[PDB]
Amino acid sequence: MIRSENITNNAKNILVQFNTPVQINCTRPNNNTRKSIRIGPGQAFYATGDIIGDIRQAHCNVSKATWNETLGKVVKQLRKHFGNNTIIRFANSSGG
Amino acid sequence: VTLQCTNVTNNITDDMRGELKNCSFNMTTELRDKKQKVYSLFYRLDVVQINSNKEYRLINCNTSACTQACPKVSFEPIPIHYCAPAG
């Protein structure tokens, strides 16, 4: 189901909710060391220590087939408010 | 405090921009009159270049000094059951 405040206003957020979940695995592989520095009396500041292992970039993963099928389901239930001969595409965000 | 900061000891390629800045700084110790030179790793979205020499500062420090989370307290959401008062 989609839900809206109302669809034809382009300021209020169309929010869509679906049935089957999409399992998303997200990870940081950079192995971190905690280090305590005492600031003064009892102010135990915490910092990163040394990076061991191999330095990478943290990243999220989703499966392809569930994403393609759930995007098919949300474009199927999003076409009902707009007429049936409607090309629907998706972009990323634009600024901010 | 003003930071003295460098790259982390990594094989740098020109296209990938470095995500870690290894900064070292002055910090007070438990006794107020002695001070220590300590070193930390920071992420590049939390440090700015103040204006050869590359001295840096934390991004919050021209807004407001701000608060460490305690490592006692966790961050995972427990459920909340909302409930109605009498009447």
Epitope: D54, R56, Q57 | T9, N10, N11, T13, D15, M16
Partner: antibody
Framework: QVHLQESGPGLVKPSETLSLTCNVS????????WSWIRQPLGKQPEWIGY???????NYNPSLKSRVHLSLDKSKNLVSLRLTGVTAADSAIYYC??????????????????????????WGKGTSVTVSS | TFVSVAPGQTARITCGEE??????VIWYQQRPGQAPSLIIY??????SGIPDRFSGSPGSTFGTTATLTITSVEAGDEADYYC????????????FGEGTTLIVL
């Protein structure tokens, strides 16, 4: 079958231009990266570097200026051209072939991987020192 | 650096800086007075021209030095070994490590 064959003048003057080549047997220069390694006497050797057609010609950044690597696609040989010799190049010099690979340690599509060379064969070694 | 091992025993030769990334060591065998040669071309993979008992270090752990283990050393292993590291975190070492030599009784 492979065998290699270096060349050098050997006994040369300081501040000069030194040119060495290496010979082929069976294979060509198109199919493999080639590599040049020098070695001072009783010391650890030094890799000058490697060469390939189509731009795959990264040098050592230690020397970086006085070196020239080149192929010979007609004569099917490989050649180095050194200029301005100092006494630190008093060395056995070496041509070599190499094969590459992909050491991969993370995500492949964030360029979190690198290459290794390894020099499988060597030449005969040519003692070129510099004196008067 | 000049480890002298009597034959039939087990040699363990170390070289190079401690590991800071995933490591791709190449070991070279050097016949004395002749040309050098290759012996180990991945961490623990051997190519042809040479049999087993040259076990290379697993490079997968962190904070270690490159160990090359030989068992049942013979007189043909009177050679000079060269470590050559290819790390992930470091830049490319264009210069090999130290000259270590194995002497057989």
């Amino acid at each position: 079958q492979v065998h290699l064959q270096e060349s050098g003048p050997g006994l040369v003057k300081p501040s000069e231009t030194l040119s060495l080549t290496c010979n082929v047997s069976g294979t060509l220069v198109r199919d493999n990266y080639w590599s040049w390694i020098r070695q001072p006497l009783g010391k650890q050797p030094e890799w000058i570097g490697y060469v390939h057609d189509s731009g795959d010609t990264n040098y050592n950044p230690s020397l970086k200026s006085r070196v020239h690597l080149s192929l010979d696609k007609s004569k099917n040989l490989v050649s180095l051209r050194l200029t301005g010799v100092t006494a630190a190049d008093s060395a056995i010099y070496y041509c070599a072939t190499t094969k590459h690979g992909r050491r991969i340690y993370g995500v492949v599509a964030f360029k979190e991987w690198f290459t290794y060379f390894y020099m499988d064969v060597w030449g005969k070694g040519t003692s070129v020192t510099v004196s008067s | 650096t000049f480890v002298s091992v009597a034959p039939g025993q087990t040699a363990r030769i170390t070289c190079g800086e401690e590991s800071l990334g995933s490591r791709s060591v190449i070991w070279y065998q050097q016949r004395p007075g002749q040309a050098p040669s290759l012996i180990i071309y991945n961490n623990n993979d051997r190519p042809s021209g040479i049999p087993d008992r040259f076990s290379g270090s697993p490079g997968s752990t962190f904070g270690t030095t490159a160990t090359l283990t030989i068992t049942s050393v013979e007189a043909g292993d009177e050679a000079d070994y060269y470590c050559h590291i290819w790390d992930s975190r470091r830049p490319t070492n264009w210069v090999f490590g130290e000259g270590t030599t194995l002497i057989v009784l």
